[PDB]
Each structure stands twice: as structure tokens, then as C-alpha cells.
Amino acid sequence: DNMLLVDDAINDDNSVIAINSNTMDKLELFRGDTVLVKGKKRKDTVLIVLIDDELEDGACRINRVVRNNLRIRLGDLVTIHPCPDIKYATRISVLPIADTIEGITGNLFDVFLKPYFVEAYRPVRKGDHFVVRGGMRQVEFKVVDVEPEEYAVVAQDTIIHWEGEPINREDEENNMNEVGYDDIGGCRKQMAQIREMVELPLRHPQLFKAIGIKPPRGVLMYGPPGTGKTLMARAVANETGAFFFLINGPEVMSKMAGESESNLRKAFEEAEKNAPAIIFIDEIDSIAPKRDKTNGEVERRVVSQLLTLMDGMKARSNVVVIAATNRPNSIDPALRRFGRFDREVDIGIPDATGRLEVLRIHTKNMKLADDVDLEALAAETHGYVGADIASLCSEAAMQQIREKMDLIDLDEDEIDAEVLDSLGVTMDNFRFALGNSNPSALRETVVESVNVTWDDVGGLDEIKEELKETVEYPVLHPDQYTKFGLSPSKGVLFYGPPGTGKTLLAKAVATEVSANFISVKGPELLSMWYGESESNIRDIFDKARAAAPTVVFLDELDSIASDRVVNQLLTEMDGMNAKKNVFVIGATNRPDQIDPAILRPGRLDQLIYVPLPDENARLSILNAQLRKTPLEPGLELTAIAKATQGFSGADLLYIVQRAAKYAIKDSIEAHRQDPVPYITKEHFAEAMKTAKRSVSDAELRRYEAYSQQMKA
Amino acid sequence: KTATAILRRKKKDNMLLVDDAINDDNSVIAINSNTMDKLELFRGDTVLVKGKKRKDTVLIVLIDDELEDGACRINRVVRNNL
Ligand SMILES: Nc1ncnc2c1ncn2[C@@H]1O[C@H](COP(=O)(O)OP(=O)(O)OP(=O)(O)O)[C@@H](O)[C@H]1O
Numbered sequence: 199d200n201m202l203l204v205d206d207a208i209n210d211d212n213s214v215i216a217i218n219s220n221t222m223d224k225l226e227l228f229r230g231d232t233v234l235v236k237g238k239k240r241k242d243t244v245l246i247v248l249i250d251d252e253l254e255d256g257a258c259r260i261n262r263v264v265r266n267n268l269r270i271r272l273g274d275l276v277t278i279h280p281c282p283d284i285k286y287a288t289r290i291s292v293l294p295i296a297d298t299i300e301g302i303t304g305n306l307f308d309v310f311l312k313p314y315f316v317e318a319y320r321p322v323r324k325g326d327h328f329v330v331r332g333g334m335r336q337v338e339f340k341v342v343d344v345e346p347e348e349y350a351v352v353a354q355d356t357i358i359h360w361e362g363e364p365i366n367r368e369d370e371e372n373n374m375n376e377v378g379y380d381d382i383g384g385c386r387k388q389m390a391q392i393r394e395m396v397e398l399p400l401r402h403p404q405l406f407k408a409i410g411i412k413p414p415r416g417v418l419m420y421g422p423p424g425t426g427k428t429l430m431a432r433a434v435a436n437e438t439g440a441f442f443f444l445i446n447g448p449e450v451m452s453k454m455a456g457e458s459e460s461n462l463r464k465a466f467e468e469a470e471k472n473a474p475a476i477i478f479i480d481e482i483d484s485i486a487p488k489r490d491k492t493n494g495e496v497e498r499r500v501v502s503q504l505l506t507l508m509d510g511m512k513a514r515s516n517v518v519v520i521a522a523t524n525r526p527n528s529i530d531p532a533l534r535r536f537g538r539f540d541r542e543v544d545i546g547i548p549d550a551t552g553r554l555e556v557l558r559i560h561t562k563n564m565k566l567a568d569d570v571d572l573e574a575l576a577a578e579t580h581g582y583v584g585a586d587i588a589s590l591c592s593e594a595a596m597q598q599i600r601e602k603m604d605l606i607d608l609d610e611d612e613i614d615a616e617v618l619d620s621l622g623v624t625m626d627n628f629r630f631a632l633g634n635s636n637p638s639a640l641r642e643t644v645v646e647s648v649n650v651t652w653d654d655v656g657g658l659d660e661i662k663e664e665l666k667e668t669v670e671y672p673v674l675h676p677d678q679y680t681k682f683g684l685s686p687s688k689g690v691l692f693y694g695p696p697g698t699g700k701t702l703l704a705k706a707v708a709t710e711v712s713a714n715f716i717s718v719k720g721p722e723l724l725s726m727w728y729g730e731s732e733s734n735i736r737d738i739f740d741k742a743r744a745a746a747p748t749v750v751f752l753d754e755l756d757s758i759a760s761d762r763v764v765n766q767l768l769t770e771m772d773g774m775n776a777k778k779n780v781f782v783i784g785a786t787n788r789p790d791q792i793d794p795a796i797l798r799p800g801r802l803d804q805l806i807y808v809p810l811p812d813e814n815a816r817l818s819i820l821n822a823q824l825r826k827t828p829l830e831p832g833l834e835l836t837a838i839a840k841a842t843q844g845f846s847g848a849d850l851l852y853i854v855q856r857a858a859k860y861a862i863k864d865s866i867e868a869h870r871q872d873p874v875p876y877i878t879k880e881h882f883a884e885a886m887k888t889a890k891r892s893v894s895d896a897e898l899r900r901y902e903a904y905s906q907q908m909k910a
Numbered sequence: 911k912t913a914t915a916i917l918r919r920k921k922k923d924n925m926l927l928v929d930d931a932i933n934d935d936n937s938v939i940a941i942n943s944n945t946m947d948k949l950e951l952f953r954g955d956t957v958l959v960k961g962k963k964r965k966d967t968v969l970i971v972l973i974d975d976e977l978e979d980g981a982c983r984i985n986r987v988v989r990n991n992l
């Protein structure tokens with residue numbers, strides 16, 4: 199409980215902290231000594247304590263400037279420690295800030311030397327910002343350097359130096375060197391995993407010695423481009439507070455031979471010198487790509503040198519290596535063996551909550567208009583990684599500038615601040631920017647989370663129970679299976695008429711067990727077969743393993759029934775270990791062309807027939823579609839359900855869509871000539887008159903015959 | 911509609927028109943007294959004239975009531991120079 203609550207202070211003094219005597223009693227502090235207050239992200243300061251009985255016990259009084267310097271807000275908890283090693287300063291060097299001296303010239307250092315340090319003995323520390331009043335201005339300077347270390351106190355005999363040039367303020371902010379856990383959202387699981395795999399070796403190495411194990415060193419995080427890998431690495435490095443050193447694949451690969459090895463050796467040696475340290479790499483694929491395609495000697499020697507350096511790392515050393523790559527399988531396989539990068543992590547596209555958090559983080563400095571509905575943007579935007587969200591915000595701001603430019607004239611070199619005061623980003627700007635966006639992650643197989651429950655599934659209760667017994671029990675009750683000795687099956691294959699609710703079933707299954715759904719359509723398999731596609735099935739299954747538990751989906755599996763892809767799929771699936779929580783769900787409308795090998799035990803052996811929806815199922819599905827669209831009061835869907843015998847979910851959805859389109863057209867005409875913003879009976883009448891069936895009766899008979907044949 | 915807002919240039923009273931000069935003066939440009947009155951221009955105070963793609967020059971302003979407001983007295987020499 200030594201931590202104390204941060205409180206707003208009316209006083210503007212930069213070297214006085216007022217606390218109650220009971221606050222000293224808690225730590226048994228003695229009057230007349232400075233105290234060290236440490237906040238977050240390795241931010242600390244030393245303040246002269248005063249007794250103010252007015253303040254209630256546990257309440258402090260620190261000006262806003264000190265809190266801003268510490269990077270903390272009101273109401274935070276800061277650790278307070280005594281100052282047994284209080285020391286005075288012998289030589290301090292400080293420089294001014296040019297933007298803070300605007301409007302007044304001259305040398306105010308001499309003006310501030312005496313009045314501000316007249317036997318004050320104000321404790322000082324590296325990087326502190328202190329504000330002094332000169333003439334008609336209040337100028338803030340920074341503590342460039344102080345001796346003796348580490349913080350010391352500003353004694354009168356201390357020699358003060360001011361020989362140098364002013365340094366910008368926002369330059370430090372944009373350095374990117376200061377980013378904590380707060381600057382990331384939507385990666386709670388991956389962030390926690392990285393923290394566990396990094397902090398423990400560095401913060402508490404004694405655990406591994408106590409338990410008798412060599413702590414892991416090789417951590418490899420991979421994900422879609424522009425997903426925040428570098429930002430997450432920087433954030434964790436700063437939060438740890440250990441020494442940092444970064445290597446860029448493009449940078450190292452851009453220098454002639456020899457120089458690359460020299461740089462790598464120097465980096466490793468320097469990191470070893472200043473342990474604990476973290477070594478980070480970027481685009482490790484570029485320096486160590488797949489050997490099967492790059493036969494050049496330069497990359498061979500570079501990768502060999504990297505391997506030798508990794509192997510030669512001493513047994514006991516607080517150094518952790520982190521690598522980044524878009525393709526998990528692109529890097530040379532030699533790096534993935536034990537004693538090297540083995541702790542693999544996959545980062546997927548953020549879900550709705552992740553998108554909301556990212557948008558909140560980015561939209562923290564722009565002049566957001568009064569009417570903003572970030573929740574709606576999060577709901578609409580799917581498949582957007584953080585980088586695309588930042589681009590969307592930038593484009594919306596650009597559109598706002600387009601709208602507001604008419605007031606000003608661009609020829610003049612100055613813009614009136616009155617216009618600047620009016621700048622604001624409205625919802626329409628975000629809508630337009632979203633309309634002019636271009637997501638790219640979704641075009642490739644990427645792991646994403648789904649949140650579909652059994653409610654969305656319109657019926658098929660028996661299939662629901664069968665699927666539950668098949669999947670959920672081994673995922674949440676493996677003890678029973680181990681006790682009985684029965685291994686869990688993994689190969690499930692749905693077959694039936696198209697548009698009967700298969701993908702939604704797979705999503706629901708993935709949601710129930712809280713697993714990362716993976717989608718792989720038949721065209722993707724065909725492209726992989728022809729080689730045009732980048733990722734291969736091996737990559738898909740490696741990502742599935744790294745993201746376990748997972749549910750992989752194979753749509754139109756008959757579209758590849760080609761034999762090489764089938765053979766590779768069989769090999770990868772059989773190689774999978776059953777104990778791992780990995781499941782494959784195949785779908786096909788023609789369960790006859792599939793090669794017999796796929797149906798062997800230990801593979802896609804479970805066969806599930808998907809029948810057409812029943813009247814109750816049709817009614818439930820229609821209700822599910824009609825959740826946001828207002829309906830004519832008294833509208834009855836039972837007649838529609840009864841008149842739609844043999845229909846499929848897709849056909850019912852299209853019926854709803856055409857009815858909505860007719861209602862919209864009627865509204866347009868009425869408005870041109872919104873009193874009627876909903877649908878009425880006539881639209882449904884037209885829709886049902888324009889009804890049909892996507893499946894012929896012959897196909898239904900064939901499906902029934904095949905299902906009965908499989909039963910017998 | 912508005913996407914091309916940047917391209918269009920705002921209008922202002924100080925911009926003027928180009929016409930051939932009756933006189934042969936080179937460094938001296940004459941404008942109507944009303945145009946000076948709108949901008950409160952006086953006699954003896956040199957004028958910075960900016961043309962196209964940053965071309966600029968300094969001329970001597972004179973009172974010429976005869977001329978249409980916003981119409982200038984500049985010959986082929988000054989036109990080439992600008
Ligand atoms: N939570 C977040 N997740 C992802 N990107 C984020 C997040 N918050 C901000 N960003 C933005 O995303 C970019 C940071 O990710 P970055 O572009 O470094 O990822 P990357 O593609 O893994 O990088 P690298 O160049 O190292 O391969 C910056 O634009 C940052 O503003």
C-alpha cells in the first residue's frame with residue numbers, strides 16, 4: 199500500500215509536493231527530505247515534501263506540469279519512496295525551447311539563474327521540464343544533463359551551462375520511442391502472450407533457474423501486413439524498460455556483402471554488453487527467405503551468419519529475439535527448429551471490439567465533430583486492419599479540409615485562425631471516406647473471430663445436438679475421453695442443397711468453443727493448385743496450429759475433384775495430431791466426386807446431411823432477416839412460410855431483398871411527387887408472385903436417395 | 911462537385927485584366943482613379959505586380975480615368991517580362 203493517489207493541484211509550483219503528516223507516517227518519512235514518485239513507463243521524479251494538514255490522509259498536491267512530465271493523469275496510483283541518497287548537483291546543462299521563447303528575444307538564462315535557484319535546492323532529474331517566468335512570458339526548459347548522477351539537487355554552487363541550440367517539443371512526441379500498452383487495442387490475447395514470453399525471462403530470470411530450465415529465446419510473431427507487429431514490439435519493449443535494438447531486413451539487405459555480417463555481429467555484441475536487452479527484427483523473410491526460390495550466395499551467407507550467431511548465444515543471458523514476417527512459412531525452415539524461433543504467434547484481423555478500440559486510440563487528437571457514432575463505424579467496417587483505419591481517418595480529415603477550403607484562399611501564405619477553430623470532422627466525412635477505402639487483408643486467408651450463436655441457426659435441432667456431442671465435449675471435457683480412451687474425431691463433412699445454412703453452422707460451431715474461424719473457399723484451392731495464389735495449404739494448416747483452437751472451413755470441396763491438392767490435404771490432415779484442438783469442416787453440394795481417400799477413418803469421415811428448412815425454420819429465418827427493417831403492423835409471415843414449400847434460405851433472403859427494393863422505390867416516387875419508411879403487404883405480394891425455387895425436384899430426389907444410401 | 915474545390919480560385923477585387931497599352935511606357939502602368947480608390951492607392955507609391963507561375967515585377971502607378979476599371983496598360987515588353 200505505499201502507492202499514493204494522484205490528485206489535481208491548484209498550485210503551479212514545480213518542486214513542491216504537499217502531503218499530510220499521516221502520509222509520512224505510512225512510510226515513516228521524516229520532514230525535510232525529498233521523495234521519489236514513480237508512475238508508469240519508467241517515469242519518475244523527485245519532489246520536496248511539505249506538510250499541509252488541510253489535505254486529507256493519502257491526498258497529495260502536485261502541479262499539472264509534473265504529472266504531464268511523468269505521463270500520468272489525475273487519480274493515478276504512483277509509488278512513493280524516500281530519498282536516502284539525496285545529493286546536490288555539481289554541473290547541470292540545460293537548453294531552452296525555441297517555440298516557448300517566441301515573442302521575446304534575449305538571454306533569459308541569466309535572468310532565471312539567480313531568482314529561481316537562490317538557495318532553493320530544487321531536486322532535478324534528467325529530462326525534467328521546469329517552467330520559469332521571464333518578463334511577460336512563462337518559458338519551459340528541459341534538463342539536458344546533470345552531474346553527479348543520477349538526479350541530484352540544484353545547489354547554488356552548481357555550475358549551469360546553456361551552450362547549445364533549442365530543440366523542438368513535438369519532435370520527442372513523434373520519436374515513437376514512448377508508446378505503452380495504452381496505444382494498442384484489440385490484441386489482448388496476443389499482447390498477454392508476448393508479455394508472458396518476454397517479461398518473465400527478463401524481469402524474473404530466477405524462476406527458470408529455480409525450476410531448472412533454459413528460458414526460451416526465439417519468439418516469432420507473424421500476421422497480415424500493417425497489423426501492428428512493429429508497434430506491439432516497441433510497446434512491449436518500452437513497457438519492459440530494458441535496452442532495445444532494432445534491425446531492419448531492408449536496411450541490412452541493402453548494404454554490400456561483409457558489411458551486413460559486421461553490422462549483425464556489432465548489434466549482437468552490443469546487445470550482449472547491455473543486458474537485459476531485446477533484439478527486434480523486421481521482414482525477416484527478406485533476409486532469410488525460402489531457399490527453394492532464392493539460390494543467390496549473398497542471402498545464403500547472411501542466413502548462415504544469422505544461424506551461427508543465434509546458436510552461439512551464451513546459455514545464460516537476458517536477451518530475447520523477436521522476428522516479424524507476413525508469411526509464416528516464407529522464412530527459411532532452418533530457423534524454426536528447436537533452439538531457435540519456436541514460440542510462434544499469429545495476429546489476426548481485429549474484431550468489432552478491436553476496431554472500436556483502435557478507432558478510439560487514433561481519434562484522440564482530431565477535432566471530432568459533435569455528432570460521431572464510432573460504434574456504427576466499428577460495426578460497418580469489417581476486414582480493416584489498424585493501418586487501414588488510420589488511413590480512413592486521414593481520408594475523412596482530408597474530405598473535411600476539402601469542404602472547408604472554400605472559405606479560405608490558398609494563394610496567401612497565412613490562414614486565419616478563425617477558420618482553423620471551425621475545423622471539425624462530421625459523420626458524413628467518415629461515411630464518404632469509408633466509401634473511398636480499400637481493405638486488402640480479407641483477400642487472403644486470415645484468422646478472424648466470429649460471434650454467431652445457435653439462435654441465428656434456423657432449426658435443425660437434431661443436427662445441432664449431434665454437432666455439440668461431436669465437437670464441444672472433446673473441447674471442454676477431454677478428461678472423459680482420456681478416461682474412456684476414445685480419441686476425438688475431427689473430420690466432419692456437410693452435404694446437401696446449396697444455400698441451406700452451412701457456413702452459418704460452421705461459424706456457430708467456431709463461436710461455441712471460442713475458436714478462431716478460418717475460411718478457405720474453393721477458388722482459393724484452385725488458385726493454389728495453379729500456383730497463382732501466394733499462400734499454400736501448408737501455410738493454412740500451420741496458421742491453424744499456431745492459432746489453436748481453430749475451425750477451418752473448406753467450401754465447394756468438390757471443385758478440386760486435380761489430385762495434387764487432394765494429396766497435399768490428405769498428408770497435412772493425417773499429419774495433424776488428434777489431441778490438438780483443430781477441426782476441419784468441409785462442404786459440398788455433390789458428395790460423389792470427392793475422392794474416396796478423403797472419406798477414410800481419421801479424416802473427413804463424419805457425413806451430415808443438410809435438409810431444406812421446414813415451415814418453422816422458414817418463419818424463424820424470415821424473422822432473423824427482419825430485425826432492423828420496420829414492418830407493416832399486423833403483417834403475418836405464416837402465409838409466406840406456408841407458400842414457400844421447398845424454398846432455401848438464400849431464396850427467402852432474396853425475397854426479402856426484392857420486397858425492400860420495391861418499398862424503397864415506392865418511397866422514392868412518393869417523396870419526389872418519408873411518410874412510408876417501411877414495407878407493406880403489396881410488396882410481399884409482388885415478391886411472392888416473383889417467387890421460384892433454386893433447386894429442381896429431381897435434385898431433391900437425388901439428394902434424398904443419396905442420403906438414404908449413406909444411411910444404409 | 912466539391913472534389914475539385916481546390917482547382918477553382920477564389921475571386922477578389924485586387925486582380926486585374928490585361929490589355930495593350932496606348933503609351934510606350936515600360937516601367938509605368940496606368941489604372942483608373944476609381945480602381946485606386948477601391949484599394950486606396952495613392953500617387954508615387956510603386957506597385958508589385960504578380961503574373962503567372964510566380965513571375966513578379968515592380969511598376970509605377972498612374973491615374974488614367976479613360977481606361978476601364980480593372981484594365982491595365984502593359985505593352986509586349988512588359989507582357990513578355992511577366
Ligand atoms: N492497435 C493497432 N494495431 C495495428 N496498427 C495500429 C494499431 N494502433 C495504431 N496502428 C497503426 O498501425 C501502424 C503500426 O503498425 P505497422 O505498420 O508498424 O505494422 P506492420 O505491418 O507489422 O509493420 P512492419 O513495417 O514492421 O512490417 C501505424 O500506422 C500505427 O499508427
Ligand SMILES: Nc1ncnc2c1ncn2[C@@H]1O[C@H](COP(=O)(O)OP(=O)(O)O)[C@@H](O)[C@H]1O
Pocket residue numbers: 654655656657658695696697698699700701702811815819846847848851
Ligand atoms: N438454418 C438455416 N438454414 C438455412 N439458411 C439459414 C439458416 N439460418 C440462417 N440462414 C440464412 O441462410 C442464408 C445463406 O447462408 P449461407 O451461409 O450463404 O448458405 P450456404 O452455406 O448454404 O451457401 C444466410 O442469409 C443466412 O442468414
